């Protein structure tokens, strides 16, 4: 094998099988070697000349919820067109239809993610952190205006470029890390809103500032404890809406004073602090809206309301496989 990663033509030379250590990666021949594994691999489409991240999802038809998780990510990402939301560049058809088991999705290529930035301990300009935050909120606005909640934002779900451009990925869960989950979500009360995403952003930004998770809970209850040890105990009843089952739980808890986030994180910019405090609030209804967060002074330099679009139209069980197949066919007319 010439190519470092072993590559071998398959099915009439219309597909290529790349080895990648015993677990083989089979894609359309338009993606010629080399490919770089980053299971996800970096590849170039020789026709469009564009480069992409190809993700292999193995045995997505085996389970119903895996299948629906997949189908949605596809339909959802295919619905969105936004600079801060990751785009699907290709969906790869199966070499033969009956054996369709593994499903490959090609997204646009990003260099890294916010998790890797944070973990790498590289310093960042204030303007960069600012830009990250702005882009997250900006994409989020669109998502929500499409009547969707991400519901799982974390640093690893935020893809980046050397250009510092940021795109959101890994959708699902909207109309196991608890660290970015909103209070209302730890207490069930299944009714919940866009504010849960806002919470996650606040948690992220602080992590970006302090370089460690803001609420690193070991379990469900430790999470809440750590939440309360910061934001303080909520107004007796006025900051409650939810099921009495959890109300009793919160009342039970010892009083927690609010901690000044400025004093705990003195290094960070005060405007940022202000915004975070508004983003981290026990009550969803007192939690700052995406819109107001974009309009917040900290983001004034980037804030342009005309450049912050909404979704023109909003969004929306085995042979869903056929659906995925149909879209793969949409991306690849030759097959």
């Amino acid at each position: 094998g010439i190519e470092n990663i072993p590559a071998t033509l398959s099915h009439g030379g219309r597909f290529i099988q790349y080895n990648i250590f015993g677990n083989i990666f089979e894609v359309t021949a338009k993606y010629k070697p080399p490919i770089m594994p980053i299971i996800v691999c970096s590849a170039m489409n020789s026709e469009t000349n564009e480069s992409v991240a190809i993700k292999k999802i193995a045995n997505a038809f085996d389970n119903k919820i895996d299948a629906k998780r997949t189908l949605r990510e596809i339909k959802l990402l295919r619905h969105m067109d936004h600079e801060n939301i990751v785009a699907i560049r290709d969906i790869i058809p199966p070499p033969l239809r009956n054996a369709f088991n593994d499903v490959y999705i090609a997204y646009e290529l990003m260099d890294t993610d916010l998790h890797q930035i944070i973990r790498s301990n590289q310093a960042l300009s204030e303007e960069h952190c600012q830009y990250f935050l702005y882009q997250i909120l900006r994409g989020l606005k669109y998502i929500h205006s499409a009547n969707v909640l991400h519901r799982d934002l974390k640093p690893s779900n935020l893809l980046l470029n050397a250009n510092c451009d940021l795109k959101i990925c890994d959708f699902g869960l909207a109309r196991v890390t608890r660290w970015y989950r909103a209070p209302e979500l730890l207490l069930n009360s299944s009714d919940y809103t866009a504010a849960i995403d806002v919470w996650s952003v606040g948690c992220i930004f602080m992590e970006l500032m302090d370089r460690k998770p803001l609420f690193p809970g070991r379990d469900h209850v430790h999470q809440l404890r750590l939440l309360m040890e910061l934001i303080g105990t909520p107004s007796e009843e006025e900051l409650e809406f939810l099921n009495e089952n959890a109300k009793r739980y919160i009342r039970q808890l010892p009083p927690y004073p609010r901690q000044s986030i400025t004093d705990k994180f003195p290094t960070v910019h005060p405007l940022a602090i202000d915004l975070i405090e508004k983003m981290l609030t026990f009550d969803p209804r007192r939690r700052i809206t995406v819109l107001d967060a974009l309009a917040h002074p900290y983001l004034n330099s980037l804030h342009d309301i005309s450049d912050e679009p909404e979704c023109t139209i909003p969004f929306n069980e085995e042979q869903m496989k056929e659906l995925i197949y149909r879209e793969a066919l949409a991306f690849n007319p030759e097959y």
Side-chain angles (χ1 to χ4, degrees), residues 1-60 62-63 65-67 70-100 102-150 152-325 327-328 330-335:
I2 296 272
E3 264 300 344
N4 189 1
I5 306 188
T8 174
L9 289 157
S10 164
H11 302 74
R14 223 144 57 155
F15 287 68
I16 298 171
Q17 302 192 342
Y18 295 97
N19 196 277
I20 317 284
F21 314 110
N23 201 28
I24 73 162
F25 205 91
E26 189 174 26
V27 297
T28 43
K30 67 176 78 165
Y31 302 105
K32 293 162 160 49
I35 66 171
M36 209 149 355
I38 50 187
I39 174 162
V40 180
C41 296
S42 190
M44 194 200 53
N45 188 332
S46 60
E47 301 175 346
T48 66
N49 209 34
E50 85 202 321
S51 56
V52 294
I54 304 174
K55 179 166 70 188
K56 180 185 167 173
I57 317 179
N59 293 293
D62 195 311
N63 188 317
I65 242 168
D66 290 342
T70 295
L71 177 66
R72 281 150 84 256
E73 197 178 345
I74 296 170
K75 296 299 289 192
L76 229 49
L77 269 64
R78 284 284 292 153
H79 194 70
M80 314 301 199
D81 183 21
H82 197 271
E83 298 171 12
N84 302 123
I85 298 167
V86 67
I88 287 175
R89 288 289 145 75
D90 194 5
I91 301 211
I92 304 189
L96 37 102
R97 178 56 166 88
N98 345 102
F100 199 7
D102 303 343
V103 45
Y104 297 75
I105 306 178
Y107 309 81
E108 44 182 343
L109 227 208
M110 302 298 245
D111 294 325
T112 187
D113 60 39
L114 194 55
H115 171 65
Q116 287 292 332
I117 293 293
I118 293 174
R119 157 175 171 70
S120 69
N121 275 319
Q122 69 163 284
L124 291 179
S125 64
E126 192 73 47
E127 232 195 325
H128 281 162
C129 300
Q130 188 196 15
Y131 188 44
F132 293 159
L133 177 56
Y134 175 72
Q135 288 183 102
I136 292 158
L137 292 167
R138 186 168 103 100
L140 215 48
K141 170 170 178 187
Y142 185 87
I143 294 170
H144 292 169
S145 74
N147 283 4
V148 172
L149 312 189
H150 193 279
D152 194 6
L153 291 159
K154 34 171 180 278
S156 60
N157 282 178
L158 301 174
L159 307 180
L160 274 59
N161 279 342
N163 203 32
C164 270
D165 304 338
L166 180 148
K167 299 183 185 301
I168 303 171
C169 75
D170 210 58
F171 282 75
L173 308 314
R175 77 172 189 269
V176 276
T177 287
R178 38 194 71 85
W179 301 351
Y180 309 94
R181 270 177 193 232
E184 64 260 40
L185 236 43
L186 300 172
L187 312 185
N188 320 128
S189 68
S190 231
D191 54 323
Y192 53 79
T193 174
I196 67 175
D197 287 341
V198 182
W199 176 273
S200 306
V201 169
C203 292
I204 292 165
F205 195 82
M206 282 311 305
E207 187 166 341
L208 179 54
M209 294 314 306
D210 189 38
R211 302 308 183 88
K212 44 187 151 80
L214 178 63
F215 302 132
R218 292 169 322 222
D219 52 38
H220 261 268
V221 316
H222 188 208
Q223 198 66 42
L224 286 149
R225 172 186 317 124
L226 295 161
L227 269 62
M228 305 293 192
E229 292 188 37
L230 190 75
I231 68 179
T233 304
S235 84
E236 226 312 296
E237 293 281 322
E238 202 203 348
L239 289 185
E240 295 77 348
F241 36 99
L242 53 84
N243 54 327
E244 293 264 2
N245 312 83
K247 286 180 161 188
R248 228 134 41 237
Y249 183 75
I250 290 162
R251 296 160 186 150
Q252 167 193 343
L253 284 167
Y256 287 114
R258 232 196 140 89
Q259 271 168 346
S260 161
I261 313 195
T262 53
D263 289 276
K264 254 232 292 185
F265 306 97
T267 182
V268 312
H269 204 273
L271 289 187
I273 285 293
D274 184 281
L275 177 59
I276 299 314
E277 288 182 331
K278 300 200 169 49
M279 286 196 290
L280 302 181
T281 76
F282 193 90
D283 188 332
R285 304 165 302 176
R286 310 211 174 195
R287 200 172 293 141
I288 188 168
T289 66
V290 165
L291 221 78
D292 293 331
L294 287 167
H296 183 277
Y298 180 70
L299 304 183
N300 208 330
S301 74
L302 296 161
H303 183 31
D304 185 350
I305 191 146
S306 66
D307 194 23
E308 292 160 4
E310 297 188 353
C311 204
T312 52
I313 31 80
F315 172 89
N316 166 71
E317 298 169 15
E318 245 308 321
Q319 281 49 249
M320 46 217 277
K321 167 188 296 195
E322 179 61 33
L323 278 166
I324 297 178
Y325 182 59
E327 203 132 21
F331 278 104
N332 301 258
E334 315 79 289
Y335 301 74

